Design a protein around this ligand. Structure first.
Ligand code: MG
Ligand code: MG
Ligand code: MG
Ligand code: MG
Ligand code: MG
Ligand code: MG
Ligand code: MG
Ligand code: MG
Ligand code: MG
Ligand code: MG
Ligand code: MG
Ligand code: MG
Ligand code: MG
Ligand code: MG
Ligand code: MG
Ligand code: MG
Ligand code: MG
Ligand code: MG
Ligand code: MG
Ligand code: MG
Ligand code: MG
Ligand code: MG
Ligand code: MG
Ligand code: MG
Ligand code: MG
Ligand code: MG
Ligand code: MG
Ligand code: MG
Ligand code: MG
Ligand code: MG
Ligand code: MG
Ligand code: MG
Ligand code: MG
Ligand code: MG
Ligand code: MG
Ligand code: MG
Ligand code: MG
Ligand code: MG
Ligand code: MG
Ligand code: MG
Ligand code: MG
Ligand code: MG
Ligand code: MG
Ligand code: MG
Ligand code: MG
Ligand code: MG
Ligand code: MG
Ligand code: MG
Ligand code: MG
Ligand code: MG
Ligand code: MG
Ligand code: MG
Ligand code: MG
Lengths: 92, 53, 74, 59
RNA sequence: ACCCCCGUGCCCAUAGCACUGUGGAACCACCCCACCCCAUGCCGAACUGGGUCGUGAAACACAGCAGCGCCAAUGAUACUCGGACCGCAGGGUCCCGGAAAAGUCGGUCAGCGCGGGGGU
RNA sequence: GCGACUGUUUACCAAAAUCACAGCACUCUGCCAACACGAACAGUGGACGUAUAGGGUGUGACGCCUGCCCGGUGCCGGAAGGUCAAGUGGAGCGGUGCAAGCUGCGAAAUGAAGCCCCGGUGAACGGCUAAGGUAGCGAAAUUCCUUGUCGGGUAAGUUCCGACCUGCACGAAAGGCGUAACGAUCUGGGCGCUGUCUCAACGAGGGACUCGGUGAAAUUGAAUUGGCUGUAAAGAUGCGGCCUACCCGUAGCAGGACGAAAAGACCCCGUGGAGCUUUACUAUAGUCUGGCAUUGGGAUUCGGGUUUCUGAAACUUGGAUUUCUAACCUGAAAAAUCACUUUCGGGGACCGUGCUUGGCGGGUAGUUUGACUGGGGCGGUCGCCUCCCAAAAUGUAACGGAGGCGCCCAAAGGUCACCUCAAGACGGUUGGAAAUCGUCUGUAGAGCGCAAAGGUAGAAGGUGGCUUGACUGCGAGACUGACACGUCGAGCAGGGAGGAAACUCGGGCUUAGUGAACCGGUGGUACCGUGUGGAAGGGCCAUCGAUCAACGGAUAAAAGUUACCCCGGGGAUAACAGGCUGAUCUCCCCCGAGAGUCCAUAUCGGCGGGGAGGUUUGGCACCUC
RNA sequence: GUAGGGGAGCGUUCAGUCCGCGGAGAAGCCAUACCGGAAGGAGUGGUGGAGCCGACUGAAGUGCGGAUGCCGGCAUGAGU
RNA sequence: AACCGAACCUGGAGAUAGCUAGUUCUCCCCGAAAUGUAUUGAGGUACAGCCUCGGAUGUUGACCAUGUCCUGUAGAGCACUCACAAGGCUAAACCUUAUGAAACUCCGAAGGGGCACGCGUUUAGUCCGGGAGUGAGGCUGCGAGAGCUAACUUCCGUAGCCGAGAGGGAAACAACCCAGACCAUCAGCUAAGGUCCCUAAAUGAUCGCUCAGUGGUUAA
RNA sequence: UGUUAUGGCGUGCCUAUUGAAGCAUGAGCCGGCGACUUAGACCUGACGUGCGAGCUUAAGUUGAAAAACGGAGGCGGAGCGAAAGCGAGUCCGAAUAGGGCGGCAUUAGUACGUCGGGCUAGACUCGAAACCAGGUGAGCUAAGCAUGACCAGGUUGAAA
RNA sequence: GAAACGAUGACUGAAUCCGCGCGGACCACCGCGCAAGGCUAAAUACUCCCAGUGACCGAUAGCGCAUAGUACCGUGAGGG
RNA sequence: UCAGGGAACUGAAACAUCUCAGUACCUGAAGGAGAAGAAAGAGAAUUCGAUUCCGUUAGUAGCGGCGAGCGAACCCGGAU
């Protein structure tokens, strides 16, 4: 700086703790065979990181009856998984 | 903006049950006793602010 | 000596027979060089601006009372 | 760079860069309006370009 | 329909002022009285409140009037876009279009609506 | 004239009036001296010295002599007080745990040397407001004007001697005025002599020249390399035009080749260097000082607590005093420094030494010390607002022409309600230019808090009523800017204000009243919080702190000097010369008022006017750093 | 058409692969009136006495008039 | 130990160098910048402008015309403000007469700008992204300031040419006049300029002018 | 082809520049040496190849007349916020005004390679004046110490 | 810095198994460990030397040297 | 290799802390290697399990005139 990066006003923070892997509705439902996801096959389902929790979020809208083991999910996602019929589970 | 030894002042605000600042140029010169006005907090507003610090 | 180098700006920002929009600035002025007609609001610094959208046309009256107005498009 | 992260030049879906309200923050106030009540956000083109060179990969 | 009056617009001096002649119980105005509504940084002068007589004086309305304002041509000019030159310089000319200000000739003392009130 | 003197000094431009010098003065130092070298409670120099000695400082033989002023700076002395660090110490405040308890910031007292405070100090820094020059000297190595005025010398004397005094800016130990002698010292004069000169001649020798032997160097774009005059980057053999000119050498000259030499040393530039300075910044060697150890005993006053007879006794703890010897230091003794049983002697809980505390510290060290700029410096100027320049959009430079701002206003804001000015003319009690009142005229000639421009009379002006929209969450859309900022803003909600009402209100007729970021202060919030639950710390909403004025702001923190100078660059930029210019300079012309007894013009030419030159001081900055 | 951006190419060394050439003479050197839009490439004669073209692909210490450039050799000044 | 305001040698070390030189094969294409703001900034840098390449868009560009709005310059004129010439009036005022103006304006062009249309011929434009360079300008004419109505002066505006532009003319000559060089030609027409001899081309034609070498250097 | 005579035309090259034949820079000449490179699991573009909503390995192991193996990990795959967190949404806030973003009508990424640039290191090549560390120097010179050597001849004529 | 923990120079100076230290001010709780005693292959770095190899050099290249730290320069370090 | 001691140019476009960098250099010890090593630990799973080395985590946490810039580790794959 004589200029324009300083003069720009921040503190903010950092943190960045737990952040989730995205598994779309449209991923499971609609396409493929219903590999019937749950706790392991998911790694071979082409959604792969670990080191993080997995979370299901609603994207695609179609009817299928499925069950899944994830670490957390979205309200509307549960709403649309049970309403096409199905189950979604959280750890105990 | 600038400040020093001078007259007037900037006080801001305070009041019953709301906790808030109007941040207003006042003056000690011609007339100063009560810095008192009416203002809107986190409440319904409708509340008197006494700006004497 | 000479000690003011800043232009302000002024002039007339939207001329006559010009398609305008709502919130546009039709003029920047010192006093009221002209006053506002229908379609036109005016800020603190004067500065006639548009209330509605339309065609901005000028009415020049009797030398020193002048007016900017907005006639409909549709 | 390690400074620009906790400051402006945040990175978006369009890889556009996020400005701030610099108007005044802490010092020199007791002056004006809703204008003040901004901490808010913004952006610009020309220094978009060499901005994210600071903080390249980690957005 | 026509006269005229009261309100109210468009036009916002070629519609303004001066001089002025007419208009009174239709409309308007003063004048009328006011403790009280309401008011006067003092006075109902102005607001405002109760109503005629009275005069049309003053104000307002209409009309004559071009002394003053106001508007103002034609011609010619000043200047100038472009084109082409002169003079060491100040400065200047030619072609070509555009073309005032002022001044003169003149032009006027307005014009166009709406609603209501009262005449023949 | 200067220094007294012999002497000494810039190896390689300065020998002196520099340095030293005997003599003088101030001051320090009592002996493991002061002082100085040094990782060092080692050693050594001071010194195998002891105040008639040693260090430091300044003057500078000898003679008369040495004045006034301590306010400031320093140095010496002082104690009644003002602040003053760690530290012994812990009322109090807050966290956590059910709890005992464990923990964070941390004070009144006790706290030294410093500094503020008082007094003295000058052959101390110093000055002629603390006082203002006592001798003595004075146009002087000091003098500007200045070749001062007179006089001496000379035919003629800006130098020189002598006076005088008007001392630009002498003066008493950074000595005053004298002084015999001294001097490869500096200055003026005279005698003598004389090639220094009028003004040069002849002679000698050693080079130069010629022949035989050996045979370099700097330099070098290449060259088939003339004169005038003109052009060209503004000094032409190399472009133009005209003149001249057969080929090639030898001896000679020094005008040109902006001739050679050294990437100018002057100047300027570089957020280049280094030496030096100091009341620039910052540290620091050194040194001062309180506490803590090394570090012990005994007496006496004193602050205090546990122990226990009705104010004494003690197991006691620190403090100042006093003193002691077993620590330690240090001397002699047959055994030079040590070591010792040692006989001893003196000092002594000190000194020293290690750790910490505060102070001083150009002794040393690292650095800082801006820009614009018709060269640099000095002067001025840096941001903001208004006019003019600005060529009828916008914009536009100048060390261009003028003038403002760093605020103010709880009402000069919000709204509602009402009000209309300056001036003139006639008449009026404090008047008789202006007050105050009344009549009459009266698009503004007034007012608008300030500068100015625009704008204003249907108000933005001038009064009152209520009031606090000088609000919170937002912002359609635009003006403007490279960015960062900056401006205008309909409409939406929460909620209020004035109005009967349509409605207006997110400060002020507008346009200046300002300041990014960083790091912190405070009130709100409850997002993060390193196993966990809290708390510390942080975040987010306010918000306070910048003549950060060099005003887009370099670090929290910074002045000078170089003639001892270095380097990197510059004809981007000064001093010389040239060039352009011609204000100034120089010179010529026009008119003809008047002088000239008469007549402007024989001469002279008011006030003005017109040119030539390119010798002047400049302007400019074009070729050459 | 200067900085500058873009395109297609010439040439040198090394490398892998292919075609070969060479004591009835390789590379290097010398001349040259041919060819190609250029970088450049041939042909022939002379020299030379061992090795080397051409094509394709890969890799570079890859192209000089300058830097008061570097190492060297040799000139000018001069038979001074 | 032959150069001492800090010796010599080796090392850090290829210090750092906003400074100065130097940067080498070919042809083909396009083609700049010396401006703005900011800068312990001023011969340096950041961003913008101006160049190139690729992509997308697809006439939005370009001139020119019509319509429409905006403007206070030139001129002009004293109606305000300051200045000012003569006379009257009983020194402001007031009237007759008469002027000056960058910071005066009752008036006010030519031109300029914005918008729309294309009614008309043209070709560029905008957006995304890669690579730049440039940020010393110079002269001339017109419009100003500064200067002395000086300068090969300076500082803005504006057109054009140098810059980075060869060819012709202007004797020579960056810029002025004419005109933009892909290559070959012992071909032709023109521009500015020329047409006696040096030298290309009428010692042309008609009516004048000047006797001075004016031509072939300026004024009262 | 070589040379020549006459005619016409013609201001070295480079740099540095507003402007160079320049009386501005550099260079005697020829030869050879001589300056934009390299490095990284780096950043971002262009082109190309391979897989493709997937794409790739690093260290290493084994084998090397040659390469295979090795999923630790890296990049697409979800954004918004200061974060807790929420999720095709999110943040601001008292729900509806906006910021960014998904659906956009919609595509595509990843590993490698060459090239364009960026950063980091000398970073185009040459050139400092200086600064710091360790050391060599008093055989020159500035001085001290110890021990030696030297000063023809003449003049003057102090104390006692 | 909210600065824990390790490490010492000065000065103080503990407990010891229902004890002790740690878990990033601190506390409780929950976990992790048992200091103030010692020794200890292997994977790791380097290249004087030796071997092999090379899209490394080939006589201004390559180490400075196709042998020389010699000639030569310096008092010396040193350079060459 | 380890330890005792420990620079500056430079970067920050000035410069003090910071950077350069515990680099250069000096010095002690030692070996063919050295150092380090058998948890009063890492760490957040009541998981791991001496040390060193490589990969990675990762320019991530975090340090910073919060400037220039500096920059870990645990897990996890490997050598042993
Ligand atoms: Mg807010
Ligand atoms: Mg013209
Ligand atoms: Mg002497
Ligand atoms: Mg000498
Ligand atoms: Mg001498
Ligand atoms: Mg002597
Ligand atoms: Mg001879
Ligand atoms: Mg020639
Ligand atoms: Mg000639
Ligand atoms: Mg001679
Ligand atoms: Mg010379
Ligand atoms: Mg130089
Ligand atoms: Mg110093
Ligand atoms: Mg304008
Ligand atoms: Mg204009
Ligand atoms: Mg900072
Ligand atoms: Mg500034
Ligand atoms: Mg700062
Ligand atoms: Mg001197
Ligand atoms: Mg010297
Ligand atoms: Mg000296
Ligand atoms: Mg010059
Ligand atoms: Mg000169
Ligand atoms: Mg000259
Ligand atoms: Mg100039
Ligand atoms: Mg070969
Ligand atoms: Mg070249
Ligand atoms: Mg040579
Ligand atoms: Mg001879
Ligand atoms: Mg000779
Ligand atoms: Mg010497
Ligand atoms: Mg170098
Ligand atoms: Mg270094
Ligand atoms: Mg072209
Ligand atoms: Mg410029
Ligand atoms: Mg610049
Ligand atoms: Mg005019
Ligand atoms: Mg210019
Ligand atoms: Mg000029
Ligand atoms: Mg140029
Ligand atoms: Mg051109
Ligand atoms: Mg010619
Ligand atoms: Mg000419
Ligand atoms: Mg020049
Ligand atoms: Mg020459
Ligand atoms: Mg030359
Ligand atoms: Mg030369
Ligand atoms: Mg000796
Ligand atoms: Mg510890
Ligand atoms: Mg050879
Ligand atoms: Mg060799
Ligand atoms: Mg430094
Ligand atoms: Mg630096």
């Amino acid at each position: 700086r004589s200029r324009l990066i300083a003069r720009l006003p921040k503190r903010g923070f950092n943190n960045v703790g737990t952040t989730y892997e995205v598994v779309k509705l449209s991923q499971l439902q609609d396409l493929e065979d219903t590999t019937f996801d749950r706790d392991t096959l998911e790694a071979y389902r082409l959604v792969r990181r670990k080191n993080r929790p997995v979370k299901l979020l609603a994207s695609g809208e179609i009817s299928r009856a499925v069950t899944v083991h994830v670490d957390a999910a979205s309200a509307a996602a549960i709403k649309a998984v049970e309403a096409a019929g199905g189950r979604v589970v959280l750890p105990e | 903006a600038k400040d020093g030894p001078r007259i007037i002042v900037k006080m801001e605000s305070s009041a019953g049950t709301g906790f808030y600042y109007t941040t207003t140029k006042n003056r000690r010169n011609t007339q100063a006793k009560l810095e008192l006005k009416k203002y809107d907090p986190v409440a319904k507003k409708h509340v008197v602010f006494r700006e004497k610090k | 000596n000479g000690r003011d180098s800043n232009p302000k700006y002024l002039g007339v920002k939207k001329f006559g027979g010009e398609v305008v929009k709502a919130g546009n600035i039709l003029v920047r002025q010192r006093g009221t060089k002209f006053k506002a007609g229908q379609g036109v609001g005016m800020g603190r610094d004067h500065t006639l601006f548009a209330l509605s959208d339309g065609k901005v046309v000028f009415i020049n009256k009797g030398k020193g009372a002048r007016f900017i107005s907005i006639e409909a498009a549709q | 760079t390690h400074k620009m992260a906790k400051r402006r030049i945040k990175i978006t879906g369009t890889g556009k860069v996020m400005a701030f309200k610099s108007g005044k923050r802490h010092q020199n106030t007791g002056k004006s309006g809703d204008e003040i009540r901004g901490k808010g956000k913004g952006f610009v083109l020309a220094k978009a370009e060499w901005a994210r060179m600071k903080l390249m990969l980690p957005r």
